[PDB]
Every structure is written in C-alpha cells, then in structure tokens.
C-alpha cells in the first residue's frame, strides 16, 4: 500500500563505520560519544496512516519521533540537541534534515538488498550505520 512499506519492521544495527569522528563533527562531548559508540541499538519504523514513528532502543536512550513528511517538527537528540528537523522522501531513501544553532546534518536511510542503510552527514564527514532485519 505504500512506498516506505519496505523500511517498515524492526531493525538491529551489525556494522559502524566514522561514528566517532560524525559525532565529533556535531559537537557530542568525550563521554556521551564513548558510550553512544558501544550502543547497538534496534530501529523500529511503523506507519499508520500518514504518520511515520521510528524509535531506537538500546542500553542508553530510547528515543521516539513521529513526523508526515515534509512538514517540520521539533526534535530533541539522543544527545540531547534541541533541533527542528524535516523528513522527506527523494527518490525512495527518508531524507532527514535537522538544524540547530546555526549547523545542520543530514541523516539518510535507504534500502539496499536485505539491509537498512544509514548515512550520516555533517560537513565533510560521513557516518555508514547498517541494519538488518530482527
Ligand atoms: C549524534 C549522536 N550523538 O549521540 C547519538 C546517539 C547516542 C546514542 C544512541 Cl543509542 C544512538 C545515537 N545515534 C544514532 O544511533 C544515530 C543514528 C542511527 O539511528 O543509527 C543516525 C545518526 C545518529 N547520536
């Protein structure tokens, strides 16, 4: 029934790649970065009507958003930024925006094969998280 039915599920993070140094990039202290690092969190997307709610689960924060697309709404990170932050689909991969203090990364998902793919932007550095079915 909808195109972002093949993000839909419950999702478990197998492989990081530049977490560290994406971290480092927003702005995330020494100690929230080490232990956000160590998280292998589970991303559970659902979609009820024209409502999308992912939610991430893991031994250091659960967090929750829920969002239409195209139309903003304010975020609070797991690191606890405060954030106004637009989620779209281009061309089949959720393209998550979030701005705050005059910065702004972008946080991408896609399918490709049997994965879920996370790109994570923030200036000249990029982050690769890889989910897989749970
Ligand atoms: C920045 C930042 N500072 O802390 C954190 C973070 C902390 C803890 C936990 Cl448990 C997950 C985190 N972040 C993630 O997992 C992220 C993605 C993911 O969903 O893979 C996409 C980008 C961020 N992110």
Redesign the pocket.
């Known amino acids: 029934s909808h195109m972002c039915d093949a993000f839909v599920g419950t999702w478990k ?1 197998v492989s ?1 790649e530049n ?1 560290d140094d ?2 480092k990039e ?1 702005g ?1 202290g020494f100690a ?2 080490k ?3 160590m ?3 589970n ?1 559970i997307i659902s979609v009820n009507g024209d409502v999308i709610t ?1 939610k ?6 659960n ?1 929750e958003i829920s969002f239409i697309l195209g139309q903003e709404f304010d975020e609070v ?3 606890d ?1 405060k954030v106004k932050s637009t989620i779209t689909l281009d061309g089949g991969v959720l393209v ?1 925006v979030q701005k705050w203090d005059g910065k702004s ?1 972008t ?1 991408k ?1 896609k399918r490709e094969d049997d994965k879920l793919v ?1 790109e ?1 932007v ?1 200036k000249g550095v990029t ?1 690769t ?1 890889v ?1 897989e079915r749970a």
């Open positions: 993070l990081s977490f994406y971290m927003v995330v929230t970065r232990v956000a690092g998280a292998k969190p991303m992912i991430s689960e893991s031994t250091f924060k967090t990170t797991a690191d930024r998550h990364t946080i998902r996370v994570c923030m982050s998280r989910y």
